[PDB]
């Protein structure tokens, strides 16, 4: 059967929050079956724990923020993307501050650390949420859509009014999340330093953790990791936001200029429409529509 997975070993990492600019220490730990992904602020006394679920998303401005009362865990999406890509069902994520570290701006450092720790299969069937009806949310010209699909696939399209320009579609049962998506970096326009550092955001942002773009070009000296890196990163963001569902998806997501707000809203509409989805397990991995890497 397709079995639940956790980490084989604990792993640690350190870095800076993109938005807050704070040094943060990160600890990923194994967790028992049906725990899901749980974030833990271990700098507070008592320790405050926020399950990574759609219901705990409190802010969606330029990142996906988990919130429980007055306590937040900011920028969960890239880490959650890495967990989903390697099929981690259960894990404690400890943090010494209010934000996941940005690392290099992509999921690469996370997938690397996870696979270094190794994966551990658990004796419980993995639960999947299967999309059985189209579910669509729109707001003005942006749209986010679930469509039934025998597998897992993400299509995205962005329309930035900028000289450097986009669309991509990836089927994750036939192409590698790691090779083709995980290295795609966070990005920001120099245009938006008015906006960002008037809202006191992106305090930790630099060329070390983001593609910086002026009116005409990428300012990073070594340029781009992929020709379509921007749209690839949006796909990475979506995978992260969709994992707040609490179970892995069988279906297709289509994004049209969507982002954190509209992705979360899709999940909330999905959850609410119980005719559009079902929980399923696979007693024989050989007949299942998706597959994962050997542990
Ligand atoms: C964090 C979220 O998941 C995300 N992924 C891609 C973009 N975004 C949104 C975003 C994007 C950003 C950003 C940014 C920025 C701007 C300027 C600089 C350097 C300027 C001179 O050294 C560095 C970084 O902040 N939030
Ligand atoms: Zn991102």
Swiss-Prot record:
InterPro entries linked: Ribosomal_Su5_D2-typ_SF (IPR020568), UDP-acyl_GlcNac_deAcase (IPR004463), UDP-acyl_GlcNac_deAcase_C (IPR011334), UDP-acyl_N-AcGlcN_deAcase_N (IPR015870)
Pfam families linked to this entry: LpxC
GO process annotations (BP): lipid A biosynthetic process
Active-site residues from the entry: 260 (proton donor)
Top-level taxon: Bacteria
UniProt keyword Cell membrane, yes or no: no
UniProt-listed Gene3D superfamilies: lpxc deacetylase, domain 1 (3.30.230.20), lpxc deacetylase, domain 2 (3.30.1700.10)
One GO cellular component term: membrane
Gene Ontology molecular function, alphabetical: metal ion binding; UDP-3-O-acyl-N-acetylglucosamine deacetylase activity
Residues that, per the record, bind Zn(2+): 78, 233, 237
Cofactor(s) named in the record: Zn(2+)
Organism the protein comes from: Pseudomonas aeruginosa (strain ATCC 15692 / DSM 22644 / CIP 104116 / JCM 14847 / LMG 12228 / 1C / PRS 101 / PAO1)
Protein name (database record): UDP-3-O-acyl-N-acetylglucosamine deacetylase
Annotated catalysed reactions: a UDP-3-O-[(3R)-3-hydroxyacyl]-N-acetyl-alpha-D-glucosamine + H2O = a UDP-3-O-[(3R)-3-hydroxyacyl]-alpha-D-glucosamine + acetate
Family: Belongs to the LpxC family.
